[PDB]
Amino acid sequence: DKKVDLVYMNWDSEVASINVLTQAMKEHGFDVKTTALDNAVAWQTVANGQADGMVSAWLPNTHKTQWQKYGKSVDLLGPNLKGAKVGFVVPSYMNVNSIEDLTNQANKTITGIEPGAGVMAASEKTLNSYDNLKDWKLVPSSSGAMTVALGEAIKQHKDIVITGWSPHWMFNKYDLKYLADPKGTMGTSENINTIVRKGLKKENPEAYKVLDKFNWTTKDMEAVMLDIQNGKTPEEAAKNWIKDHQKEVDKWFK
Ligand SMILES: [Cl-]
Ligand SMILES: [Cl-]
C-alpha cells in the first residue's frame, strides 16, 4: 500500500514540478494526493505532519520568513533545482539596467503577485534598502494577473517593473531582463528545495527516498511550463516530459 500526500503553491513553476513528480510516482504504484495552498499554509501543513512534503521551498532568501518559523519542525532534504533566481524584471526596451537607476518610471510602482509570496517580502525589503526607491510602492495582484499586465504593457510599449523569477516561461515569450541588485536584497544564490515532515523517513521510507532523490533542471521545468501555456493539461504535460526523459526519471525510484 504505497501512499503519499503532497502540497504545492499556485506558481507556474510549482504546478510543473508537482505534476511531474505525481505522475512519475503514480507510474511506480503510489497513491498520490496533492493540494494547492498559500505559501505559509503549505509550510505549516508539512510542519504539522498533515502533508508528507513539498518540492517548492525557495531557499535561503525567498522563503526565509517561513524557514525561521517552521525550519525546526521539518526535514530539509536539499536542492531539487539549482540556480533559480528572483528579482525586478523589466522589458528589454526600458533604458534602466539596475535597481539603483530607477527614478520615476512605471508610476513608481512594482507590479507584484499575491501578498504572501516570498518574492513580495524581498521586494518590500528592497524598497526600504535602496534610497532611490523611497517614493515607490509594491502593488499586489497574483501570478496570473502579473503576466497579463506584463503582456498589455508590452503591446503599448509601457514602462513596467515586475516581481519576476526563474524558471518561468515568460522569458521565452517576451524580451525581458533582470535589473542588477548590487545590495542583493532580492536574493543571490537561490535553489528550489524539497522538505518533508519529520517522521517520514521512519514511517514512510518508500516515499522519503523518492522525494530525497527528486531533481531536475531549469530547462526541464521550462519545457513543462511551455506545454501548459500552449493548451496541454498539467497531467499530459508531465507525461510528455517523463516519456522524453524516462531514464532520468527512473533514477528517482532506485
Ligand atoms: Cl533533495
Ligand atoms: Cl516567505
Structural domain ending residue among the three candidates 163, 181, 199: 181
- 96, 162: one domain: yes
- Tell me the CA–centroid distance for residue 187 and ligand 1, in Å: 20
CA distance 122 to 131: 16
Structural domain ending residue among the three candidates 181, 213, 242: 181
Give the CA distances from residue 73 to residues 48, 67, 109, 151, in Å, rounded to whole numbers and listed in that order: 8, 9, 37, 41
Q: Which residues pair with 137 in a beta bridge?
A: 109
- 173, 102: one domain: yes
- Tell me the CA–centroid distance for residue 231 and ligand 1, in Å: 30
Q: How many domains does the chain have?
A: 2
- 102, 226: one domain: no
> Domain range spanning residue 212?
1-82+189-254
- Tell me the CA–centroid distance for residue 111 and ligand 1, in Å: 32
Residue 89: closest CA among 47, 35, 14, 147: 147
Q: The C-alpha cell of 48 is what?
A: 504539522
Q: What is the DSSP string of 125-174?
A: HHHHH-GGGTT-EEE---HHHHHHHHHHHHHHT----EEEEES-GGGGTS
- 103, 166: one domain: yes
- 165, 237: one domain: no
Contacts of 107 (CB under 8 A, 6+ apart): 159
- Tell me the CA–centroid distance for residue 209 and ligand 1, in Å: 9
- 89, 118: one domain: yes
CA distance 188 to 181: 9
- 68, 194: one domain: yes
Whether 178 and 88 have beta carbons less than 8 Å apart is answered as yes
Residue 168: closest CA among 18, 15, 61: 15
- 244, 121: one domain: no
Residue list for the binding site for glycine betaine: 63, 118-119
Domain CATH code at residue 151: 3.40.190.100
Q: How was this structure determined?
A: X-ray
